[PDB]
């Protein structure tokens, strides 16, 4: 059984009777008349609505936290996927596997009508990236978010401010690894480890990157994947954040994103040399710094450089200390937020330095990310 | 009368005749047919494309103001809303209430095909937020906009910078109270009110927030909604534009926002305790300085924090002055623009001081709050 | 042939059998049934899926360079464009037309599946802008890009980090004479020039805007079109860029957007007049100064304006220097970038001057600007 059909140039100069259906033969859509509208009402052909993807509330992200190990997709839910319409009309839980503390995860929405979370980031076990739509995730932590000012406990949980959907997320290159801080921008979970190249900026128990232990060298701006920085320059960690889309906090994302942290406390001892994990000859254990929004080691053991520059300045002579690319002149010094494990009663959530040049590299100073908020 | 029809799994190896249609059994949807091409072409479901919202002119605002008090939709406009299409082939008139100066306005466009502004943010009057959807808003202002660099006047009417939808809008978590200064960003049209909470941060005819009337505390950051904090330091003014998902203006969005007030010119007297009203022995009227794009109180008015640091420097030792979260070292000066009332001819849109430290609150110093324009 | 049909409140309490299908007579579209779900399953509308763009990798650009004058659309690009759906389904060259060095270029989708780049910004050769459809551009440079650090070679050809879509782009106005750093943020190609209300701010062969010759004054900010500023102050520099949506660079974005540039070495002579052009007197060829992201002039060519304060600050007094907008107290030196023509072995792409105010102008001293990268 064959429609009646035309060309669009002939479908143009033609009233159909009203519910009649007639069939776009360029377009192979069907156009519904009403009897007097020339050219009809042509319908959509669903390759114009692949990768679609509608929520209820838009201003909030698709995903509820359900408790320490679990969390479901929101109602109102809508997505396609593989040629399908996939909808959830009611709060559905998320099929978990095996979490892991300090790990990352991704969850799908599949062809079959299921949703479920997985360590893969390419496709789920038991689905491939066709049947399979990633559609957000989050991540599975060491420990609380703080309740208050005191940071969190050890207790290895979802982070509710960790989940991001395609929608809802930081703008970075890469979601992994990151919180939503008061909802209006995101921070690295983790202080920036060496192997970020490999491990992104935000993972949980990898070495620190600071002056002792210099970032790997971007390969974006002349790095071989293997070589690291001569030192823990300012411009060396501006560098790492801007390869992965991010940026060095300023003064006013610093006291929001540690906010919740045990202020005017530090780590004590000599290092803090692994995110995530006690420092060397602390007297206080790393989740003491834990922030509202589960910023780990948030403030008190390393200082993060800033995205800004005020205070003391280097001499008002032309100065070739940029790792040779070129010189400076009257340099204001770099931001320095948060305080590091030998700063005493003087770290904490707006702990502020203004006195260390950019060109500088020394053991407690290291860097943490941040990009903004993205809704779409 | 039934339709031949098949699974997608019996669809995927089907040529059906030129214009034959079937029915997809699990999609529950048609598929139209060529006579060669296997699978068909399946057409798209209405629940893949709901909150479509597409305007012809993407890079500019979906209305036009017409008049101090009217406004139309643009032509081109097709909205989606409770399963129908509405569109606007031509320019259309949106149904206005009873306006009221100070107050912000939300734009519905309803499946019955009507359109209309209303003072509830939900749903308007005679509508449930079901069959109305809400697609943008506008301020309705005390007075005009400057027309050049003298301020504006006293008439209410829709200033049209403030006209904002739902793909052409501030960033903000809130949009109400803003403008959009020469295409690139928005700002808040009054200073931080104290009741920024229940107000927001931009409402006409209430208590500016200063030195001498600190805002109510974050809910966010350990406030409880009624208790204030204990002074005006930069970082309390910053911590609340970090709630509401702004920030405080840099130097070169300072003086866009504020061009059009009239320059090296200040309020006057010993006060201005609430926005978009005359100052305490004022000697010039508030209208004075309205900024180009219906910015209220723009300069000579309060000094507004601002997002950056730098200028004179506090101690260069570690000093615990941040409200018990940690010590700041040889910290610069935040940034203050706009000028106060008591500043005499050194007010203006470029008025900069740069010598208070963030921890310092004065009775002229407050907060205007800007984020992103964001066009989708 | 006419279908079975009502309204859409007779359609709510209506259960047709299994693969029936019928007509809403409001809505203009079929529903398909299943034999119990009352209502049905609406189709959608062609109308609502208007401007739809799809890409199969939504975090790089819709297009390759597969040469120094060709390029290709990706497969997977899915396009909506007067009605029709346009889709490409393997990689395929985009028809070029004659191409010359320093210009910019629009790629169109067009109704009947071409698609070709045109220098003609509505709507290429032979077609209209109903019938083609703006989806992205690039830049046609007068060299290479550095493929090391030791600038670039005089072969004009595309730049390959010049490519935009419209869901992957620029945040500015504008995204013409733009190019993307690292993935991270777009940089204006070319130096500000006199003319940037005609030109756009980034232009191949245009006089160059510094103290010496200043900006047309911003239309936005009560310019009429051919007054030009009284000086090169930063102030109007800073207003250029807010005019075109864009900012002057922060230290950060600044050692991106120039990384690749010849290092510590300056252009020579007394001048640099004109963009993508060798300098008065110089020693070293414009060519020597291209970034790894094809800016030009990047470092040694004339200083840049910062988007940053500090450094050595003016008189702790109030002081009118602000064109007539107010004083300023204690103010901060504003960055200067890049390094100039007579600064020898000071230039770089990290070189930085923090002494100049913001009131000052000099020869030079010019601006390039930056914004966002925006991924939809
Ligand atoms: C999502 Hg399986
Ligand atoms: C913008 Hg990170
Ligand atoms: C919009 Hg009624
Ligand atoms: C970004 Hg406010
Ligand atoms: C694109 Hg013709
Ligand atoms: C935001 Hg330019
Ligand atoms: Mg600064």
Redesign the interface.
């Known amino acids: 059984?064959?429609?009646?059909?035309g060309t669009?140039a002939q479908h143009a100069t033609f009233t159909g009777?009203?519910?009649?259906?007639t069939?776009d033969?360029?377009?192979?859509?069907?156009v519904?008349?009403?009897g007097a509208?020339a050219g009809?009402?042509?319908?959509?052909?669903?390759?114009?609505?692949?990768?679609?993807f509608?929520k209820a509330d838009?201003?909030a992200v698709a995903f509820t936290r359900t408790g320490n190990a679990t969390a479901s997709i929101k109602a109102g839910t809508?997505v396609?996927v593989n040629?399908?319409?996939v909808?959830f009309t009611a709060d559905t839980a998320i099929t978990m596997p095996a979490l892991t503390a300090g790990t990352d995860y991704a969850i799908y929405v599949c062809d079959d009508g299921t949703v479920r979370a997985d360590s893969n980031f390419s496709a789920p076990t038991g689905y491939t990236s066709t049947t399979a739509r990633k559609v957000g995730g989050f991540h599975y932590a060491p420990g609380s978010n703080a309740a208050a000012?005191a940071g969190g406990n050890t207790t290895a949980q979802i982070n509710e401010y960790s989940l991001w959907d395609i929608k809802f997320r930081p703008?970075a290159?890469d979601p992994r690894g990151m919180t939503l801080?008061?909802?209006?921008f995101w921070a690295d979970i983790y202080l920036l480890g060496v192997n970020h190249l490999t491990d992104g900026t935000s993972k949980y128990n990898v070495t620190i990157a600071d002056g002792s232990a210099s970032p790997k060298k971007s390969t974006?701006?002349?790095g071989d994947g293997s070589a690291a920085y001569s030192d823990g320059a300012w411009?060396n960690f501006?560098?790492v954040?801007?390869?992965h889309?991010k940026?060095?906090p300023?003064?006013?994302?610093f006291?929001?994103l540690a906010?919740g942290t045990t202020?005017?406390t530090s780590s004590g001892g000599t290092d803090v040399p692994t995110t995530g994990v006690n420092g060397t000859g602390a007297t206080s254990a790393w989740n003491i710094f834990t922030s509202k929004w589960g910023v780990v080691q948030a403030?008190g053991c390393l200082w993060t450089w800033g995205?800004?520059?005020?205070?003391?300045?280097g001499a008002?002579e032309?100065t070739?200390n940029?790792?040779?690319?070129?010189?400076?002149?009257?340099?204001?010094?770099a931001?320095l937020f948060?305080?590091n494990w030998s700063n005493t009663?003087?770290?904490?959530?707006?702990?502020?330095?203004?006195?260390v040049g950019?060109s500088n590299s020394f053991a407690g100073i290291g860097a943490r990310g941040v990009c903004?908020?993205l809704?779409?």
Chains 1, 2, 3 share one sequence.
Do not use: C
Not at 25 to 30: A, E, L, P, Q
Not at 250 to 253: A, K, V
């Open positions: 059984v064959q429609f009646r059909g669009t009777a009203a519910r009649e259906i069939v033969t360029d377009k192979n859509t069907v519904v008349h009403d509208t009809g009402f042509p319908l959509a052909r669903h390759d114009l609505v692949k990768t679609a509608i838009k201003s809508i396609e040629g399908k319409l909808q000012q703008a290159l801080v008061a909802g209006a974006k701006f002349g411009y501006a560098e954040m801007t390869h889309g940026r060095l300023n003064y006013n994302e006291q929001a906010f202020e005017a403030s995205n800004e520059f005020g205070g003391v300045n008002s032309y070739a940029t790792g040779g690319r070129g010189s400076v002149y009257a340099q204001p010094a931001a948060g305080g009663s003087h770290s904490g959530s707006r702990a502020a330095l203004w006195y950019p903004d908020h809704i779409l």
